[PDB]
Amino acid sequence: GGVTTFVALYDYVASGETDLSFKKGERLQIVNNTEGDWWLAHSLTTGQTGYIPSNYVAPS
Amino acid sequence: GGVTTFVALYDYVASGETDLSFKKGERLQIVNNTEGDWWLAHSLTTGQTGYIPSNYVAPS
């Protein structure tokens, strides 16, 4: 059965606003683009990232 | 060429820690699983989400 969790091998310090910092030994999930009808999105105004309902958006 | 940016149609208030809040009219990117060797991850310890170098992790 597929793995549920990954562990960090090293410390990582983020340089941008889309990447994630973490400490060696930290426990992390690798996540999917989509969760049902929810898509992963990155807010250009608040710089944060997360899933959103795909029916709440339209192309520019 | 493909769309670069989406616009919010309504306000959304997040309920969990994997979902993203945004206001109507916010400009958002829908993001890809991977960017090169980098995968999207969700930190169970800090609750934050972001890209990480895939060579910095191992399965549990």
Residue numbers in the entry:
A (entry chain A), B (entry chain B): 81 to 140
Sentences from the paper on this structure:
The Src homology 3 (SH3) domain is a ∼60-residue modular domain that consists of two antiparallel β-sheets orthogonally packed to form a single hydrophobic core. This domain is present in many proteins and regulates critical cellular pathways by recognizing polyproline-rich motifs (PRMs; Kurochkina & Guha, 2013). Three-dimensional domain swapping (3D-DS) is a mechanism by which some proteins can oligomerize by exchanging identical domains or structural elements between monomers. In previous work, the 3D-DS of the c-Src SH3 domain has been characterized and its dependence on experimental conditions has been described. This work explores the role of the hinge-loop composition by interchanging residues in the RT and n-Src loops between two SH3 domains: one being the c-Src SH3 domain, where 3D-DS has been described, and the other being the Abl SH3 domain, where 3D-DS has not been described to date.
Nevertheless, replacing the residues of the RT and n-Src loops of c-Src with those present in Abl results in the formation of intertwined dimers. Crystallographic structures of the intertwined dimers of the Src_Abl-2 and Src_Abl-RT chimeras were obtained. Interestingly, both domain-swapped structures differ from those previously obtained for the WT c-Src SH3 domain. Indeed, the open interface of the Src_Abl-RT and Src_Abl-2 chimeras differs from that present in WT c-Src SH3. As in the WT protein, in the Src_Abl-RT intertwined dimer the n-Src loop is the only hinge loop, although the open protomer shows a different conformation. In the WT protein, a salt bridge between Arg95 and Glu115 stabilizes the dimer. This salt bridge is not present in the Src_Abl-RT (Arg95Ser) and Src_Abl-2 (Arg95Ser and Glu115His) chimeras, where these residues are replaced. The analysis of the open interface of the Src_Abl-RT dimer shows hydrogen bonds that differ from those found in the dimers of the Src_Abl-2 and WT protein. In this dimer, the n-Src loop adopts an extended β-strand-like conformation that facilitates the interaction between residues of different chains in the open interface: the Asn113A side chain interacts with the backbone atoms of Val111B and Asn112B and the side chain of Asn113B (and vice versa). Additionally, while maintaining the hydrogen bond between Glu106 and Ser123, the distal loop exhibits diverse conformations in the c-Src SH3 domain. As shown in Fig. 8(a), the two chimeras that form an intertwined dimer exhibit the highest B factor in the distal loop. However, although the intertwined dimers of the Src_Abl-RT and Src_Abl-2 chimeras have been obtained in the presence of low-molecular-mass PEGs, this molecule is not part of the dimer interface.
